Structure formats: structure tokens, C-alpha cells
């Protein structure tokens, strides 16, 4: 089987994709954010606090004839931009791009944390990371790729997306007509639960290539690249006027500046990131100050290849019994 879905920014900036998923029987339709940084598939719902619901749409499971509660199951997890939710647990029949899981497991919220509240565009997440992750206790749940992967034609799932326009989701084959050149295939080290890897280098605009390994995540649920301070220092010091902001939270920029690119190593492979995609625009409303789209990872304890870098790219999720990721300009 193969499934294939559309994923479409949630505003003018790119600052997360969604992708719609059936749930259920009949079809209830949500709009999740596809991220290939944690394991949980979880829902706005009938179960949650009703103040907490802005503008979402909800799973209810006792309007679907497959739902089933999955007796004392709870999951509670908290991001890395600090937000969180929790809840309980249903099973229920889940459809992605024309490709069907029965029995996947849906956390339903009872609460979430006001950044989820105050986004009505993101109707929940589907989790793509491994399933070591996953936060269901007392009984850890598999994901939606976990759980299809024998079913695909190929143990392969691929991000395609947009700068500033719709992107793809597919699962189980590689679409040879959505990148150029060739596929430069890396190793992944499962051991964080995530697709973790090894970049070569980098270079800033039309600078020389630096080798140096870079070792960080594949993750479409966070929106900017944060990368080692050194790095990211090199590339805004080509930026007049540039400058690390405490008050603002990361480095900012001149508006009115015409941003470098930033290219990434994959193996002897190199992947450009157009200046225009760094750009996250104004900090507050009518500011001539801009917010990057690279920032520094020190005191994330991590590097994150997010949806600026993984824009850039066609990437392959290779589930294979020993996972690697591929990266193809496009």
C-alpha cells in the first residue's frame, strides 16, 4: 500500500504545516501537524476542556462506530518550545493520503497548554519519530508509520515541503519526479528516539565549504534550523546589522537586508537553503526588526534540521531494519 497527502503551511511564514487525517468511522477529518520529532498522535476533543478549544476542530469518539477506549491508557508530553498536553486514549481507524491504519492508537487531550489553545489551525500532532518515544502509559503505542510499515510497498515515508506553498507527505514510495539529481542517503542513529544524524559541513552564501560534523535531528515539527553558536554566528556576521537579541529571544535582523543562503553537508551531497527562507519576518507588528530563521541550539542540548533546512530538501524516512535518511535538492 502507499498513502500520499498535501501538507500546507498555517500562515505566511511557514511556522508549521498541516496535513488533513481521517479518524474514525464515518470520516472525521483533522488537520495535524506531521512531526517527525516525537510519537504521539494526539487530538483536540470532545474531552477537552472546553476552555482550551479556540477554534479547533474536534475528534469525538462516541460519534465513531470503531473508536474503542483503551481501558486506563494515559499519555502526557511537553515540546521543546515549552508547550504540552495530556490525556487519555482511544484505538480507532486512521487514514492518511489513502492509506488505512485499524486499531492506531488517537490520544484524546482533556488539556492543553495555551500555545495550542491559541493556534486554531493545528487540530492536534501525528507523530513520526520511533515509537520508543511514545508517551502512553502504562502500555507504550506505536505510530501511524510504525503501524503501516509492513503494509507499505516500501518501509519508506518522504517530506516534500513548501517554501510559502503546499508540500507532500508520502508514504511507502519515493516519488522519482519530485527531486533533481540524486538521493544522498546518510546514517541514523536511533538511540535518542529520533532520526538523528551526522551533517558535513556548512557554507554561508557563496562562502568555502566548512567540513565539520554536525551532529543533529531531521524534525518537521520545529520551524527554524537551530544549529552550534559558532555556526550561527558565522552565518549572521554576513548580515549587516544583525545581532543576538536577549529581550527578543535569538538574532534579528534589518528588515530591509537581502539574507545569504545557507547550505548543509550530507555526506560529499550539499544542500542550499535560499536567503529568503531564513527570513520569519517582523518580531511584533510593523517592527523594521526581523526574526532569523537560524538560530543557536546552545542550551537546547540539541542541533534541529526543522522545516528551514527540510524545506530546502525532498527528505526519505527510510524505516528499514537499519533506518537512514535521504536528502535530494529539488
Do not use: M
Given at each position: 500500500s502507499t498513502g500520499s497527502a498535501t501538507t500546507t503551511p498555517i500562515d505566511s511564514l511557514d511556522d508549521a504545516y498541516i496535513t488533513p487525517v481521517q479518524i474514525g468511522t464515518p470520516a472525521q477529518t483533522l488537520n495535524l501537524?506531521?512531526?517527525?520529532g516525537s510519537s504521539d498522535l494526539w487530538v483536540f476533543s470532545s474531552e477537552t476542556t472546553a476552555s482550551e478549544v479556540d477554534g479547533q476542530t474536534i475528534y469525538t469518539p462516541?460519534?465513531?462506530?470503531?473508536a474503542k477506549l483503551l481501558s486506563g491508557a494515559t499519555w502526557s508530553i511537553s515540546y521543546g518550545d515549552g508547550s504540552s498536553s495530556s490525556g487519555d486514549v482511544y484505538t480507532d481507524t486512521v487514514s492518511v493520503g489513502g492509506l488505512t491504519v485499524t486499531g492506531q492508537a488517537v490520544e484524546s487531550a482533556k488539556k492543553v497548554s495555551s500555545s495550542f489553545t491559541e493556534?486554531?489551525?493545528?487540530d492536534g500532532l501525528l507523530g513520526l519519530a520511533?515509537?520508543?518515544?511514545?508517551?502512553?502509559?502504562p502500555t507504550q503505542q506505536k505510530t501511524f508509520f510504525d503501524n503501516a510499515k509492513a503494509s507499505l510497498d516500501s518501509p519508506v515515508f518522504t517530506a516534500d515541503l513548501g517554501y510559502h506553498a503546499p508540500g507532500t507527505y508520502n508514504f511507502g514510495?519515493?516519488?522519482?519526479?519530485?527531486?533533481?539529481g540524486s538521493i544522498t542517503y546518510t546514517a541514523v542513529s536511533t538511540k535518542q528516539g529520533f532520526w538523528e544524524w551526522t551533517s558535513t559541513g556548512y557554507a554561508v552564501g557563496s562562502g568555502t565549504f566548512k567540513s565539520t560534523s554536525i551532529d543533529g535531528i531531521a524534525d518537521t515539527g520545529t520551524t527554524l534550523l537551530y544549529l552550534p553558536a559558532t555556526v550561527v554566528s558565522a552565518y549572521w556576521?554576513?548580515?549587516?546589522?544583525?545581532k543576538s537579541s536577549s529581550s527578543v529571544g535569538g538574532y534579528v535582523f534589518p528588515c530591509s537586508a537581502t539574507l545569504p543562503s545557507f547550505t548543509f553537508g550530507v555526506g560529499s551531497a550539499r544542500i542550499v537553503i535560499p536567503g529568503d527562507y531564513i527570513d520569519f519576518g517582523?518580531?511584533?507588528?510593523?517592527?523594521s526588526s526581523c526574526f532569523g530563521g537560524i538560530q543557536s541550539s546552545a542550551g537546547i542540548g540539541i542541533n534541529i534540521f526543522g522545516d528551514v533546512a527540510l524545506k530546502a530538501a525532498f527528505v526519505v524516512f527510510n524505516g528499514a531494519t537499519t533506518p537512514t535518511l535521504g536528502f535530494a535538492s529539488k
Amino acid at each position: 500500500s502507499t498513502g500520499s497527502a498535501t501538507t500546507t503551511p498555517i500562515d505566511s511564514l511557514d511556522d508549521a504545516y498541516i496535513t488533513p487525517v481521517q479518524i474514525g468511522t464515518p470520516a472525521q477529518t483533522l488537520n495535524l501537524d506531521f512531526d517527525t520529532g516525537s510519537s504521539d498522535l494526539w487530538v483536540f476533543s470532545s474531552e477537552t476542556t472546553a476552555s482550551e478549544v479556540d477554534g479547533q476542530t474536534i475528534y469525538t469518539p462516541s460519534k465513531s462506530t470503531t473508536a474503542k477506549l483503551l481501558s486506563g491508557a494515559t499519555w502526557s508530553i511537553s515540546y521543546g518550545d515549552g508547550s504540552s498536553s495530556s490525556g487519555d486514549v482511544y484505538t480507532d481507524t486512521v487514514s492518511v493520503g489513502g492509506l488505512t491504519v485499524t486499531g492506531q492508537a488517537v490520544e484524546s487531550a482533556k488539556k492543553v497548554s495555551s500555545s495550542f489553545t491559541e493556534d486554531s489551525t493545528i487540530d492536534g500532532l501525528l507523530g513520526l519519530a520511533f515509537s520508543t518515544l511514545n508517551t502512553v502509559s502504562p502500555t507504550q503505542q506505536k505510530t501511524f508509520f510504525d503501524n503501516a510499515k509492513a503494509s507499505l510497498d516500501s518501509p519508506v515515508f518522504t517530506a516534500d515541503l513548501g517554501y510559502h506553498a503546499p508540500g507532500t507527505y508520502n508514504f511507502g514510495f519515493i516519488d522519482t519526479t519530485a527531486y533533481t539529481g540524486s538521493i544522498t542517503y546518510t546514517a541514523v542513529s536511533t538511540k535518542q528516539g529520533f532520526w538523528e544524524w551526522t551533517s558535513t559541513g556548512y557554507a554561508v552564501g557563496s562562502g568555502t565549504f566548512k567540513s565539520t560534523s554536525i551532529d543533529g535531528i531531521a524534525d518537521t515539527g520545529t520551524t527554524l534550523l537551530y544549529l552550534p553558536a559558532t555556526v550561527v554566528s558565522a552565518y549572521w556576521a554576513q548580515v549587516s546589522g544583525a545581532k543576538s537579541s536577549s529581550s527578543v529571544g535569538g538574532y534579528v535582523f534589518p528588515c530591509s537586508a537581502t539574507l545569504p543562503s545557507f547550505t548543509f553537508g550530507v555526506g560529499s551531497a550539499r544542500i542550499v537553503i535560499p536567503g529568503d527562507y531564513i527570513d520569519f519576518g517582523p518580531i511584533s507588528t510593523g517592527s523594521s526588526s526581523c526574526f532569523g530563521g537560524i538560530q543557536s541550539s546552545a542550551g537546547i542540548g540539541i542541533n534541529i534540521f526543522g522545516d528551514v533546512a527540510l524545506k530546502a530538501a525532498f527528505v526519505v524516512f527510510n524505516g528499514a531494519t537499519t533506518p537512514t535518511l535521504g536528502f535530494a535538492s529539488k
